Amino acid sequence: DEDETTALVCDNGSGLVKAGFAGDDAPRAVFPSIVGRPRHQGVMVGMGQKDSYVGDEAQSKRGILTLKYPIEHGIITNWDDMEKIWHHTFYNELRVAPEEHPTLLTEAPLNPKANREKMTQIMFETFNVPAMYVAIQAVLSLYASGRTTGIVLDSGDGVTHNVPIYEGYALPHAIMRLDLAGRDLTDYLMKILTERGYSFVTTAEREIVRDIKEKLCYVALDFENEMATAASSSSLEKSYELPDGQVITIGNERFRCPETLFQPSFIGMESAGIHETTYNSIMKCDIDIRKDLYANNVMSGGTTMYPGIADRMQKEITALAPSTMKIKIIAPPERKYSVWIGGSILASLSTFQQMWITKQEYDEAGPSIVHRKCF
Amino acid sequence: DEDETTALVCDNGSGLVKAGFAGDDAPRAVFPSIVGRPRHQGVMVGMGQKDSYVGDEAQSKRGILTLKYPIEHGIITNWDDMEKIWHHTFYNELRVAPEEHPTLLTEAPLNPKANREKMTQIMFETFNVPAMYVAIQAVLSLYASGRTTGIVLDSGDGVTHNVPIYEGYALPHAIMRLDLAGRDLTDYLMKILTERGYSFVTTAEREIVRDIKEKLCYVALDFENEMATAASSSSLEKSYELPDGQVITIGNERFRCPETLFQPSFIGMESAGIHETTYNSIMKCDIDIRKDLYANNVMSGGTTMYPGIADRMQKEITALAPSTMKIKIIAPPERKYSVWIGGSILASLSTFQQMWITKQEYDEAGPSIVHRKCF
Amino acid sequence: DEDETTALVCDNGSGLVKAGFAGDDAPRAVFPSIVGRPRHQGVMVGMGQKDSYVGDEAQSKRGILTLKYPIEHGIITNWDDMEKIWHHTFYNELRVAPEEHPTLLTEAPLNPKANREKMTQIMFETFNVPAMYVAIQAVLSLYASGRTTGIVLDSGDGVTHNVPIYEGYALPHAIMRLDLAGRDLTDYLMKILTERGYSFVTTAEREIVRDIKEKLCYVALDFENEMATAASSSSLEKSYELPDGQVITIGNERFRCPETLFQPSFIGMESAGIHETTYNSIMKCDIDIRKDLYANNVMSGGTTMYPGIADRMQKEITALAPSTMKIKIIAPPERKYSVWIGGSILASLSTFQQMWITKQEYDEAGPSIVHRKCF
Amino acid sequence: MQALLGARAKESLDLRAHLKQVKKEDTEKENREVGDWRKNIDALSGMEGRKKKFES
Amino acid sequence: EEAEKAADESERGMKVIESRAQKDEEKMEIQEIQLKEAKHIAEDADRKYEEVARKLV
C-alpha cells in the first residue's frame, strides 16, 4: 500500500479513531473506538464468529453484541481493548503499522499525563514504533486551518479543551476546559426522545440515537425563535428511519440537543456554555493579544458540523466582547477531520523532524519520556 | 452395515420418530412414536400375538390395539416405551447396536429438563452408547434449511416453539412457546367430522383422522372467502378413502381445522395465532436483529406442509411488520424431515465433535451432565 | 357525603392500582390493573355475565376471561381500559365521584410525556374532576419514608426509576431509568418453572405464577452461597398450592428469578442491574451530595418485600462504593404502598393546595398543561 | 468506494452457500443408501396342488 | 430440481443484481442528497458570493 516510511497519524477519542498516514489530508479509514462482545449464548456450530469484535466489525455484528468504548473523556481506561483496535487499524485496514513507521498521537494540553505515558509505552513495546510524538490538538487544528493564532475549541467526544494560542505560543492561564462534548449532547437527546416515547437504552439503541443526532440536529443562530416555531409546528419535524423500518419523528429536540453547547445546564453541568468559555479564553489574555484572538475563534473537532454553529458562536462572542472590536470565526470544511489533518501536517513538517522521540531515547528513559520530550 | 462409527440420529416427537445415521440426508426408517397393546381377549391359540407392538408393528396390527405414545407436548414421560421404540429403531431397521455408535437426540429449547436428562440416561445405561448429545431442534432446522438467522417455526405434533436465532445464537427471551400443535388439529378435525356425521372415537379412527388431515387439509390465503364457497358447494369437497372401502367427503372442514393455527381459539387456546406469535418473537428482539429475522422466517417441523401456509404466513406477518422491510418465508422440501436432517448435519460436522458427552464423563457425573455439556 | 373535599388519591401501576382518600394511611382498595374479556361462547342465558370486567371482577371471573393490562413499563397504552378502572376504583369502590373531589395521580419523573398528559386529560374530560395534579412517584416515596434526601429505587412491576433527590431537589442528570421490573421476574419464573416440569403460558397460569412469586420468592443477600445449597438439596425447596390442588416446589429458582434484578441478562436485558444503577444515581451527583445519598438508599414500590432485597441492595452498593463511606438502605413497612401513602401526604399539605391544575386552566391550555403545572 | 458493499455481498453469499454445502455434502454422500423394498405378491401361484397344512 | 435450482441460481444472480440495483438506488439517493447539497452549495456559495461580493462592492 505504501512505498515510504512516512509517519502514521492517529486521533484516538471516545467516539472514533481517525487514522491514516502522514502526508495525506484525510484519514484513510475511520475506526470506531469500540470493542464488541456477544451478550448471547451460541447454539449453532461452524458459524465462524469472533471472541471479540472491533471497530467496524463491532458495529456490523452489533445486533447481538454489547458495545463498549475503552476511552472516557479523552483517557484510555482499557488499553487492552485499544491494542486490539489498533492492531486492526494498522495491519488489516490501513495496511501500515508503527513497526515500520514513526507514529504521531493527538492530545489535549491538560489530558492527564499518565494517559500519554501509557500510549507511549504501547506504541513502543506492542507495535515497535521506531519513534513517537504526542501533539497538541489545538496545534494540529491551527496548522490545518492555516493559522498560528486563535482559540481552539477542539470539541472532542468526551471533553472540550478550549486553548488560546498566540504567535505559535500557548497561553495556558487562559485555558477554559469544559466537561461537555459530543457524547454528552447524545445523552441529552436520548433523554428528550425518551420523553416522546422512544427510549434508547441498549447498545443498538445507543448507536441509533448517536446517528440521529449526527444527521438531524442543528444549533441555529437563535434558539428561542427556532423553538417558538419548532414547538408550535410540524413543519419543523423530521422523521428518521430506524433499522427495523419504523420511524421516529423529532421536533424541537432536533436543536435542544446541540443547544447544550450553549446551555450545559441541560445535562446538569455548572457552565455558561462554549461561547462564554471561548470569550474567557480571549478575555483572560493580555489586551495586545485579545485583538488577534477575537479575530481568530477556531472551531475544530466534532459537533461543529451542526448547522448555524458558525453564526451562533460569532454572534454570542460579539455580544460578550467589547464594541469596535471585530470578532471572526473559522469553521472550515476540514471540520472533525482537522485534528487528524494537522497531525499529518505536523508529522511531515521539516521543522518537526527533530521533534520525534526515537526508540533509543525511549528505552533509556522509559514511557515517562513523553512528559519531557513532547509537552 | 456402516463402514464407520457414524453417530446415530433420532428426532422423537408426540407424532412420529424419524431415525437414521449421521451423514445421510433422510432417516432410514420412520415409526409412529407408538407402543400398541391389544384391547381384545384372544380366542384362538397358536396365533403368535404380542403383549405389546412397537412402531410400525403397532400400526400394522392397530385394528385391535390401543395405541399410546410416550411423548406429550415435546416431553418423554414414558421412557419404557421410548426404550422399546429405540431398540426396534436401532437394532431392527437401522441394523445397528448403539454400543459402537455415539447418539444424537433432540429437544425444543424450553423443553422441561427431565427430557434431555432421561434421554441421556437411557442411551448410556440401557444401550451403552459410547457418547451422547441432545441437540436443539431449532439449530438442526437452521442447518437443514440453509440459515443461521431466522425464526424457527416447527409447528410440530407437540408444540409450536417459535424460536429466534441470530448469527447462530439464541435469543431466548423472545421464544414464544405455544400450546398449538398437530395433535390438536387432529382432535379438532374429528370434532368437525362428527358434525358431518362421521364418528371418530377409537385409536384406529384417531390415526385415520390424522391421515385425512395430512392428505386433504389446507390453510389457503383467505379463510372467509374460501369458506364462502366451501360451505355453499360440493365443488370444494374432497373424498377420502376409509380403510373399509367407504368414503368421507370433507368441505369447509378441510380448512377450518388448519385455520386453528391462525385462530387457536378453535381448540380453546388463549392465543393470537402463529403469524402474530412469529411477529412477537421478532418484536422482542433488538432492532438490528429484527431486519434479519423478518427476512428469514423459516419453516421446519410439520403442519408447515399445509397448502398456502408459507404464502399466508408471509402475508400475515408483512401485515403486522413495519413498511419498507422485506418479509420472507423459507419453506424447503426438507419439510417434516429437516429437524432429523439437521441432526445428521450437526453430527457429521467436524465443528461438533468436541460437543459429545463421553461414556466416561457420563458415569463420573451421572445424567445431569447433560445440562453442562449440551446447551 | 364526605367530611371535606380532599383529593382522591390513586397510584396506577403496571401491576396493581391502589386508591383511597387524601389524608388516610392506606388505600381503601387494591385492584390489579386489569380489564377482562370472555374468550368463550356463552351457551346458557340469564347467567348475567358482563362483556368486560374490571379490576377484581376481572380477576375473580378469570376462569373464562383473557386478561389485559392497560399499563406497561409505567405508562398507559390503553386509556379506555384505564377509564373503566378509574370509574370502578373511585366511584364504584371508594364511593366518590371525581366530579366533586380533586384527584392526585402518579408517574415517574422520566415517564414519557404522553402518559402524564393523558392522565390529566381523562380525569378532566371524562370524569369532570375539578382539579388535577400528577405526583412524582419518587417524591411520594420520600414523603412516606420521611426523607428529603436519598435515591429512590422503586423496583415495581413496570419500571425501576433510580432517582437521586437531595434536600427536596432532583438531580435529573443522574437518573438511571431502567426497563427491568417485577413483570419480567414473573415471566422469567413462568419459563424457569416450565424447565422444572410445570409449564405456565396462559392468563390463569400467569396469575398463578405471580401468586407463587409473591409468596415463595426471595432475593438472597448472598446468592452464591444460597444457590450452592439450594441447587444441591431439596431442604431448600418450598411447596406452593395451586388453585386445583397441585403442588409445585421451587429450589434455587426461588431466588434466581428475583436475582434478575441484579442479573438482568437472565431475561435478555442489557443492564448493570438495580444495585449499580443505585450506585450511579449516587456517583453521578456532586461529591457534597453523594455523602448523603450513600447513607440514604430509599427503597420503595413492590418486589421490595422479597427477603434479602434490602441487604442485597446494600451489600452490592457497598462493594461498588468507596471505603470509609457509610452505605445505608432504608426499607420501611410502607413498602409497595409508599407511593400511595406519600400521595395522601402530598395531597393534605397546605402548601400543595397551590399546585393544582383547576378545571378552568385545563380547558384554556389543554392537557399539555400538566408540563406547565405539575412537572 | 465500493469495497464495503462488495465485501457485504461476499459475506452474505458465503454464509448462505456455506449452510447450503453443509447440507448438500452429506446429501449426495448418502443418496442411494436410502432405497426401499420390492413388495411382490405370491398370488398363490407357485403351488401345484393342495397345501400340506390344515388350512387347505 | 435443476429448473428450480436454475430458478434459485437465477434468483441468486437476481439478488446480486437486485442488491446491486439497491446499492445503486442507495448510492443514487445518497448522490441525490449530495446533488441537492452540492447544488445547494453551488447556489449557497453563490448566495454567499453575492453576500460577500456585495460587501466587497
Short mmCIF file of C-alpha atoms in Angstrom, two decimals, chain B residues 23-26 28 142-148 296 344-345 348-349, chain D residues 15-16 18-20 22-23 25-31 33-35:
data_model
loop_
_atom_site.label_atom_id
_atom_site.label_comp_id
_atom_site.label_asym_id
_atom_site.label_seq_id
_atom_site.Cartn_x
_atom_site.Cartn_y
_atom_site.Cartn_z
CA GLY B 23 -24.02 -38.16 7.28
CA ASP B 24 -27.21 -39.25 5.49
CA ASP B 25 -29.95 -36.84 4.25
CA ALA B 26 -33.03 -38.74 5.29
CA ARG B 28 -33.53 -44.89 7.36
CA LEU B 142 -31.46 -23.84 10.61
CA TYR B 143 -28.75 -26.09 9.24
CA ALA B 144 -31.15 -28.19 7.17
CA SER B 145 -32.89 -25.07 5.84
CA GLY B 146 -29.68 -23.18 4.96
CA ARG B 147 -29.87 -20.41 7.65
CA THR B 148 -28.01 -19.09 10.77
CA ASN B 296 -35.79 -15.07 7.36
CA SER B 344 -27.43 -35.67 10.62
CA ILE B 345 -25.60 -32.44 9.77
CA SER B 348 -21.38 -35.04 10.65
CA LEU B 349 -19.81 -31.56 11.17
CA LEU D 15 -22.77 -17.80 4.73
CA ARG D 16 -25.74 -18.85 2.60
CA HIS D 18 -21.96 -22.41 3.49
CA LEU D 19 -25.19 -23.64 5.04
CA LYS D 20 -26.13 -24.98 1.60
CA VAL D 22 -23.23 -28.30 4.90
CA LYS D 23 -26.47 -29.75 3.58
CA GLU D 25 -22.31 -32.74 1.18
CA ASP D 26 -23.95 -35.49 3.23
CA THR D 27 -26.95 -35.19 0.94
CA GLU D 28 -25.00 -36.55 -2.04
CA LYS D 29 -22.76 -38.74 0.12
CA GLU D 30 -25.83 -40.79 1.01
CA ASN D 31 -28.38 -40.67 -1.79
CA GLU D 33 -28.19 -45.93 0.55
CA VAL D 34 -31.79 -44.79 1.11
CA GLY D 35 -33.62 -47.27 -1.14
#
